[PDB]
Amino acid sequence: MNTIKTVIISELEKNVDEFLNSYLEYLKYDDYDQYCTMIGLYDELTDQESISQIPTKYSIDPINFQKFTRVLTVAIYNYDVNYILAEKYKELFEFTNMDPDFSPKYRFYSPIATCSYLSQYDLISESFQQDVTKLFDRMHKQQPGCMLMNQIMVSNLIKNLLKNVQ
Amino acid sequence: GHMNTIKTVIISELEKNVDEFLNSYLEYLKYDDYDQYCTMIGLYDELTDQESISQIPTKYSIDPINFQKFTRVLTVAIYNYDVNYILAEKYKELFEFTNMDPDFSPKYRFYSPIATCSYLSQYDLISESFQQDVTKLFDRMHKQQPGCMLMNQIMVSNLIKNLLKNV
Amino acid sequence: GHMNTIKTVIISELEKNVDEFLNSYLEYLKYDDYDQYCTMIGLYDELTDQESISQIPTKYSIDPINFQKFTRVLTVAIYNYDVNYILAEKYKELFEFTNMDPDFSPKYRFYSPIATCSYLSQYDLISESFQQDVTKLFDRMHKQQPGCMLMNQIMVSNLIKNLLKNV
Amino acid sequence: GHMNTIKTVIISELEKNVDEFLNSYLEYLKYDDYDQYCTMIGLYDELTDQESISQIPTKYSIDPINFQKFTRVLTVAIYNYDVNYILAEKYKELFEFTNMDPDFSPKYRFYSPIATCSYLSQYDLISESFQQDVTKLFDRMHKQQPGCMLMNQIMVSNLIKNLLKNVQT
Ligand SMILES: [Zn+2]
């Protein structure tokens, strides 16, 4: 609402919403309804207190809250620029035990394609970090050249805009 | 925090992409055409008043048909990177000279400069129906473009709109 | 003797394209002019000495001014397909018969024979200023040519030029 | 010089266009993918036997996925510049490695390297149907090409074919 960084964050979160909406295709019944409730709330998941209160405040099962946070971390990985989203959700990474400094060498993949591959991984696996690392690597090897250049153009343009304090 | 420097910051960023666009079309030019075009790349942000537009070709020894062709390549570049017509507003005197449509804005923008110039090299830049050719150009690029790229092209265009409105 | 084979075959191939240029110009001739030009297309490789050149009208029963018009059109075709002046040096005496510049070479060559003959149709072939008309002809086609075509024309010229190096 | 030297002169000239073709695709690569591809541009003329094809990636630290993608871009370049299959014959062991069709030949050749690489950047280089993608690639460029460009591409191919008539191989 205020600065360039806050507006960029809100715009990146709009794309995080679309990423999370793409995963909804693979959820059903009550898990679908709890996940939808989480999409409209995750920007509160910035401190350990709020992280522990909202699953019970909004009646979300601990397993569904666990699975949502892991899909949210992959979304953050896909849309982050200069770790501004990883820093904002600093305490979310401490809750889900995932690397806050990981960043794939290419970002802004298709949310439909990314969730299509993510749908066949065990979200709460102890090896989920390396599963995410292999997921972006596979999409990198698969991606045509024109798409990758578009992806680095998006990241570079946002990086240049963030350098503008004056 | 607000003011108008966000619009200035965005314009400088969009003009960096205009630079790469203009450099990409250099691949289709040799000899004097290449030399004159390179001179215009360093001068195009001065094409904001009718006096400069008049003096540039004779002052820098630019063939008038090469000046006309450059302003048309530059216009296609503006079409490809403009958001909320801020570039068209800044270069409103350029549109007054070229007589190109200042309200034209393609369905999707921020196409690859190499891909766009490859299509643009197929057209007669001094055609009297060049405006219709530009419309065909952006339509052809949209009908071939995968949805994954069009996604990000909308994303950047919406991000810049958000930055401009909400400072 | 492979380098002389390369130069001989390349000269023969360029003349094949001169033939197709001359065949395209037949569409602008009617009735008797058609017949004599068809003949001259088959014998222009004999126009290498002033003796032969002067004997052509009497030997082949060709109108003297239809021959001189043919030599002018042939000169334009040589300009359009020459590389390293191998055609200009072979037909050097023809350039002395027509008094056309054997050192002239346009910035780009290998234009369309259909497009070239269409513009050439507007010129008087035996005008004394036909050399300046030819300069306008190639300069006009350069100005109207899309960038992708010009890059294909220079690609063709560079490849043949590189094959001829060290001859 | 013997007539068969004409073949060597032509191959040397066609590989110059292969170099420009390979340098054009560099626009669609960044970081270490760009670096490994650059190293391969200066080594592809050694990919004429299976033992060299096997050892070049290890000796120069090229990742198998990048080596495979390089050989597929090299194959499209060979398709775009070959005449009388002289390049496909010289690099027949490359076609053995890539499993690409050594007998494929587009309707026209000598398309612009910038335009072709722009089309090529839209495709998955390691797709199982890449051969079908290549066929469609050249067919798309054919149907969009203006006739005067095509006729110059015919003229160059015909000139090289006539030169090769003097070669008994
Ligand atoms: Zn020899």
From TrEMBL, chains B, C:
Pfam families to which the protein is assigned, alphabetical: ABC_C
Protein name per Swiss-Prot or TrEMBL: P8 RNA silencing suppressor
Organism: Emaravirus tritici
From TrEMBL, chain D:
Domain of life of the source: Viruses
InterPro entries, A to Z: ABC_C
Protein name: P8 RNA silencing suppressor
Organism listed in the record: Emaravirus tritici
